[PDB]
Ligand binder design. Sequence first.
Ligand SMILES: [Mn+2]
Ligand SMILES: [Mn+2]
Lengths: 451, 451
Amino acid sequence: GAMNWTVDIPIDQLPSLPPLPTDLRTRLDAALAKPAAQQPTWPADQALAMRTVLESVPPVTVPSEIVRLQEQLAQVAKGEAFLLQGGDCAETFMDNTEPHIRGNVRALLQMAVVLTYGASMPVVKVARIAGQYAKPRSADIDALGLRSYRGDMINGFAPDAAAREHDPSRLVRAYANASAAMNLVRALTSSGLASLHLVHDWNREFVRTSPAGARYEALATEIDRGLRFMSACGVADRNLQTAEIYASHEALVLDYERAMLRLSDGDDGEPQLFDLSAHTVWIGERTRQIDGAHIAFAQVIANPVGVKLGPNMTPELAVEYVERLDPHNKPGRLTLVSRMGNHKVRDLLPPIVEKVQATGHQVIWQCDPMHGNTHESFKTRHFDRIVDEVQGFFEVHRALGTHPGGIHVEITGENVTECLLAGRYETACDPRLNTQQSLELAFLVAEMLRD
Amino acid sequence: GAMNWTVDIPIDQLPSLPPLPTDLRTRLDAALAKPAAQQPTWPADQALAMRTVLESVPPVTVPSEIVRLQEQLAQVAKGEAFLLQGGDCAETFMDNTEPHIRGNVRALLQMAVVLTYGASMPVVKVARIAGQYAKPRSADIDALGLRSYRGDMINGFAPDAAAREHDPSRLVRAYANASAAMNLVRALTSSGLASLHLVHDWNREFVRTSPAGARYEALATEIDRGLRFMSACGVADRNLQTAEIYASHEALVLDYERAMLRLSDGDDGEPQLFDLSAHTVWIGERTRQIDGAHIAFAQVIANPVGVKLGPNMTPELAVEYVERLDPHNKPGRLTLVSRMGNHKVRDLLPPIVEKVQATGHQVIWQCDPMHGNTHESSTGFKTRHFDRIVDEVQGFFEVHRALGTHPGGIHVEITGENVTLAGRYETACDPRLNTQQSLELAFLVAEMLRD
Ligand SMILES: [Mn+2]
Ligand SMILES: [Mn+2]
């Protein structure tokens, strides 16, 4: 109650949920019985109580949006669209506010106009938002001797032991934060925030008040003339696609993902399991065990999925991911997310690309220039290394004649640090690019797209 | 806990955003110094703490949707559109589920297409949803000798004393539920659920399987032919609209409404206070004291508002509402909601309408045939006669026809489930018309609209 600073929710006399088709039950249980890395260590009975609450809430997303996303991603996979994915490294309940969310929505719309122009093709916009509340860790004890912070879905950022304990009630606070943020992203994307003219006036402000501004002025002016041309031709906002921003996060906490599963109706074909906590999810580098629960869970859901591929990836293993995760040969169903470091991508990526291409499957190739790039000191990342990874990624694909399909970026609408610091280091986890650096990267990637 | 079948969800105490401007807060404080009827009895310190939580959460609606609704309501006020408002008498946390929300959304869209055809003008769709969690009560002790149930925002439905205490942790729980429901209504209304052709196929199934189906066959077939005609003229899905369903509830719990106040960004007109817990709200019969806090709160917010007018209403008091609540003469800013009873509306409404018309202001005249037509059945249950409901609407139309004024809308309490007289009594409050009856009523009101 208010006196205890808690919301009390009775679980009993809640039930009556329709059973899954027998095969889906069997497969889902088989998937979840496999070993699972990076899971919270909280009690099974408390976890179950939280899942029962979540099994009956309104979903974050609906199946029809997910099949629409799959159709748009199929275009990307065929070389006819580009994927922009970006947002907070880790969302926090603390920053889950209208200014912060609007900041991320705007930054992503800004980047998308620039990339659409540079690419001369549609850009699919996927935010890391409305559920990016869990993060894997190498070590279970951090530099201070505390149990590691694993994101607000699991424990608290505060540096004391009680705050670090794994708290299954965070599954429910994660959901409430997620749907509040998704609700606002839907409102914002059908407001005037999404009109291209407005979005690009922001980019022109960036060009004035920026040290590298002169570098980007020509392209910003070219884009502005392209937009004014559109209107001169009689194209008004009403004659356009309303902005669609999709929600994604790493599918890490299987207690959360399984509780957000819903069965589709009879208007696809056969009923299918959709993870309705997001439109698309990805499986990270530490949870991608080929026979682990995460890959297997991914095989059971209908959502598009991604898999992060680090420097230790082989062509053979990459092909096994494709055959397990895209077994019906559905373009767009699978994204392979390269995160290799700028010093390694030119050498390690081509043989992987060649092998997968040879299978006849059409994956999206997406560059994650964040997580292969890092250095000692504050966790931080050089902008030039990030740019250079995306650059080498484009070189790999140009040489093979394959599609450089997208980028996956960690960013904020906030004027933060990390780009070389103590001034406003604000992240709950990894170094982002601030507003400015994100935008600068879009411009630079637009140039690689024109080339 | 484990012994209890209850889970306690901690409410995160998070950093506050900047406060609302001092001048608007000074105005609000003066308004809320007025006495307020029907308020929860929870302590001021708990109420304050809960409000503070809610001052920084993402809003449920945004200012631009509210100004859009205002524009569409101005059309209603001018006799060029029709207002449909409907949904649960009281939403509960327990029934705030995908199936129940989808069923109410469908019912409203179904009713809307029938009334649009009958009216030959646009219908504005306002759901009683995403916040209808508080009800007034005439006594504080119910028939079981317990403190009265006042809605899930205030206390619990369960017939036990602990549940009936007023706990302002329910403010936060209400917010999370409202957000999640609004999220789902946005998703549903840009899915194929919204498609006119799909919607009316439900209407045709209703005609096939209902008794007295043959009474509505002709209009249903007529409407079908109207849709096939527009499709034959090349009109496809995307030339129509996106379905817009707005959220409304009674502004009852001022701690909730005031915590949800936000300042607009000033990119439109100048910055002002909007209640972003909903698009529009109304003030009920028990809380409309001309000098009370509810009417004063309504003066300060930019949202469109309604006031329920019962049988004791005088033409002079009605004019006072117009002067307080539409001082600037903005058509459709105020809706006067007539709930007189079917035996009283023909006599009591005309002098109210005449006097208000004489002001020069353009209110929306909306008929609420529910809260004047309640009784209790011989077999215990609180009920309402369908025929009496129809006749009040009938009477409301006759008053407007005779005056040359616009019968502007209906306000109805309904569900998408097949509810009843002891078989399926499930409301938590007043007897909703079921799916079928609310639909049937739309057919009947369409015929009154054609006349
Ligand atoms: Mn990261
Ligand atoms: Mn009622």
